[PDB]
Design a protein around this ligand. Structure first.
Ligand SMILES: CC[C@@H]1CC[C@@H](C(=O)N2CCN(C(C)=O)[C@H](C)C2)N1C(=O)C1=C(C(C)C)N2C(=N[C@@](C)(c3ccc(Cl)cc3)[C@H]2c2ccc(Cl)cc2)S1
Length: 85
């Protein structure tokens, strides 16, 4: 539905997992974010609800060393701090 426009650095991250537009639905952003987390192993097998993104571009952009996958609104907050008109 509605389109969001990533800042350059987030756009960089999305493109590193094969994205090729300037604008995306939130659903597409989360798809690519998932791909990025899985292909970079940004988690620990013993804690499957936590993304560990400290010392990764993703942590720089989201401004946190880890976050919970069950905390959806905060995930949207962090994405929105990386969005532009
Ligand atoms: C944080 C990633 C977690 C840890 C392990 C792995 C997982 O369950 N498995 C399944 C079990 N397994 C094996 C080897 O059998 C592996 C450990 C892989 N895993 C995931 O697959 C998850 C995924 C992958 C598709 C990325 N997601 C999850 N919530 C998902 C469904 C999700 C959560 C929140 C929101 Cl808003 C949207 C989607 C998705 C995801 C997507 C984007 C972001 Cl930023 C965070 C999470 S939980």
């Amino acid at each position: 539905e509605t389109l969001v426009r990533p800042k350059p650095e987030l756009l960089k991250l999305l493109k590193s997992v094969g994205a090729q537009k300037d604008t995306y639905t939130m659903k597409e952003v989360l798809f690519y974010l998932g791909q990025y987390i899985m292909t970079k192993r940004l988690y620990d097998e013993k804690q499957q609800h936590i993304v560990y993104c400290s010392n990764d571009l993703l942590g720089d952009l989201f401004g946190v060393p880890s976050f919970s996958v069950k905390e959806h609104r905060k995930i949207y907050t962090m994405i929105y701090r990386n969005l532009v008109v």
